[PDB]
Amino acid sequence: MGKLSEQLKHCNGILKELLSKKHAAYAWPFYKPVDASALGLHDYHDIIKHPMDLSTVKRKMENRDYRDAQEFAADVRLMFSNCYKYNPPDHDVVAMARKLQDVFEFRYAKMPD
Ligand SMILES: CC(=O)N1c2ccc(C3=CCNCC3)cc2N(Cc2ccccc2CO)C[C@@H]1C1CC1
C-alpha cells in the first residue's frame, strides 16, 4: 500500500522481466557476476571497482536491501555502466547492454507516483 512498497513492486516486476526468456538473447551476459578469472580478464577488477549483475540485484531485492526505487535503479545502471566502461564500444556485449538498458529505462519510466 505504501509508496516505497508500490514503487519497489514495479522495480521487482522490471527485474523479473530482465531475467525472463523474452530478453534472454541479449540479457544472458548480465545474469551472473563477471568471472574475471574464468574469462582471463586479469584487469577487470582494477578497472571495475563495483561489479554488478542481475543475480546480485535479485539477491538484494529479496533481502530487502533496496529501500527505494532509486537505489535499485542505481545498481541496474551501474551494471550497464561497468559494461560500457570495460568493453570497447563496438563489442557485441555493448550492443546487448544497450538493448537491455532500453528495456529497463522505458519500463522504469512507467513508475507509479
Ligand atoms: C558482462 C560483460 O561485460 N561481459 C561478459 C559477461 C559474462 C560473460 C559470460 C557469461 C556466461 N558464461 C560465458 C561468458 C561474457 C561476457 N563477455 C563476453 C561476450 C559477451 C557477449 C557476447 C560475446 C562475448 C564473447 O566475447 C564480455 C564482457 C566481459 C569482458 C567483461
Swiss-Prot record:
Domain of life, source organism: Eukaryota
Compartments where located: Nucleus; Chromosome
Record's function text: Chromatin reader protein that specifically recognizes and binds histone H4 acetylated at 'Lys-5' and 'Lys-12' (H4K5ac and H4K12ac, respectively), thereby controlling gene expression and remodeling chromatin structures. Recruits transcription factors and coactivators to target gene sites, and activates RNA polymerase II machinery for transcriptional elongation.
Note: Some specific inhibitors of BRD2 that prevent binding to acetylated histone are promising therapeutic molecules for the treatment of cancers or inflammatory diseases. ABBV-744, a small molecule, has been tested on tumors with success: ABBV-744 antiproliferative activity is mainly restricted to cell lines of acute myeloid leukaemia and prostate cancer and is able to displace BRD4 from chromatin. GSK046 (iBET-BD2), which specifically inhibits the second bromo domain, is a promising therapeutic small molecule for the treatment of inflammatory and autoimmune diseases.
Subunit structure: Homodimer. Interacts with E2F1. Interacts with (acetylated) STAT3; promoting STAT3 recruitment to chromatin. Interacts with CTCF; promoting BRD2 recruitment to chromatin. (Microbial infection) Interacts with herpes virus 8 protein LANA1.
Entry's free-text remark on domains: The first bromo domain specifically recognizes histone H4 acetylated at 'Lys-12' (H4K12ac). It also specifically binds histone H4 acetyl-methylated at 'Lys-5' and 'Lys-12' (H4K5acme and H4K12acme, respectively). The second bromo domain recognizes and binds histone H4 acetylated at 'Lys-5' and 'Lys-12' (H4K5ac and H4K12ac, respectively).
Name of the featured protein: Bromodomain-containing protein 2
Species of origin: Homo sapiens (Human)
Full protein stretch here: 344 to 455 of 801
